[PDB]
Every structure is written in structure tokens, then in C-alpha cells.
Write a protein that binds this ligand. Structure first.
Ligand code: HEM
Length: 153
């Protein structure tokens, strides 16, 4: 359970993201795909992309980055009271997209890295720890739904 002070740190940096949702989504997906290429293989939509320059030039990838970060921002702004938002995401990512929990750990690392690059003054260690906690809570609650459905592994 995050404290109120931890949530304020999370949402203070997140408010900085929402000024350029699409640029953050590109950086985060690109980092994810470069750092963990098995993740790219889960997107039929993106698996033709073989270079970082091709990734950066894809408008469809940029669109999907906005989809991802819009869903995550709606979850973070619930401060843990996010059952209604996680249900459908857990269900589609477990049963349709077939995304292991571990890949959610990978994208959490990419989110943290990109927020540190773009917002260092609002993402010192206290905020990095709080955001780590927020993303861990996201994964914990998604993993419980995966387990229900038979996909925790
Ligand atoms: C912060 C974590 C994530 C969030 C908030 C998120 C959010 C979303 C949303 C909102 C959609 C569209 C609606 C739906 O299908 O449920 C989507 C689609 C999808 N997601 Fe994620 N996602 C996350 C992580 C991942 C990861 C790590 C992967 C793969 C490694 C992944 C793979 C996919 C795929 C394959 C689709 C369908 C894309 C398409 O072909 O249109 N997601 N995600």
C-alpha cells in the first residue's frame, strides 16, 4: 500500500508526462523492444520493425504508446483503487495478447528509465522509489488476476 506522500510523488511526475504523452510512449516502447526483444515479437502489428530508426518513424507505434500510457495514467490516478481498470487489461493481456507478468516488469523498467531521462528534477530517488512501488502494485494486482485465470505460470 502506497502512502499518500508516495502517491503525490507518483502523480507529480505523471503530470509532467501528460504534456507529451506520445513522446513518452515512443521512448518507452522503443526502450522495451530494444532491451527485451522477445517483447516485440508479441506485437504482430510491430514485428516488421528491425531498427530503432524504423521504430521512431512508425506512427502506428506512436499511437499505441499513447494507448498504453493513457491506460496507465488512468490506473495511477486511482491511487490503488484501480480494480475496474485492471480487470479488463489483465483479462486481455493474459488471455488474448499472451503477455507474461515478467514482460510487465520489463515495461515498468522502461517507464522508470524514460521518466528519469525526461524529468530528473521531479524524479529523484524518493519519486523513483514511489513510482517503483506504484508499478509493483500494478503488477501484483494484475498477477492475481492472471492467477485466477490460470496464467500466472
Ligand atoms: C503498462 C503496461 C501496459 C498497459 C497499460 C497496456 C495497455 C494496453 C491497452 C490499453 C491495449 C489496448 C486494449 C486491450 O487490448 O486491452 C493494449 C494492447 C496490447 N498490448 Fe498492452 N499494455 C501494457 C503492457 C504490455 C506489454 C508489456 C506487452 C507486450 C510485451 C503488451 C502487448 C499488447 C498487445 C500485443 C496488444 C494488442 C496490440 C494490437 O495488436 O493492437 N502490452 N495494451
Amino acid at each position: 500500500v502506497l502512502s499518500e506522500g508516495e502517491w503525490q510523488l507518483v502523480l507529480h511526475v505523471w503530470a509532467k508526462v501528460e504534456a507529451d504523452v506520445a513522446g513518452h510512449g515512443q521512448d518507452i516502447l522503443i526502450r522495451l523492444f530494444k532491451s527485451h526483444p522477445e517483447t516485440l515479437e508479441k506485437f504482430d502489428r510491430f514485428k516488421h520493425l528491425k531498427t530503432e530508426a524504423e521504430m521512431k518513424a512508425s506512427e502506428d507505434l506512436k499511437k499505441h504508446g499513447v494507448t498504453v500510457l493513457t491506460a496507465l495514467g488512468a490506473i495511477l490516478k486511482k491511487k490503488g483503487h484501480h480494480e475496474a481498470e485492471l480487470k479488463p487489461l489483465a483479462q486481455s493481456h493474459a488471455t488474448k495478447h499472451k503477455i507474461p507478468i515478467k514482460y510487465l516488469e520489463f515495461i515498468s523498467e522502461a517507464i522508470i528509465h524514460v521518466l528519469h531521462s525526461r524529468h530528473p528534477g521531479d524524479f529523484g530517488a524518493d519519486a523513483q522509489g514511489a513510482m517503483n512501488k506504484a508499478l509493483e502494485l500494478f503488477r501484483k494486482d494484475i498477477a492475481a488476476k492472471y492467477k485466477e485465470l490460470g496464467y500466472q505460470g
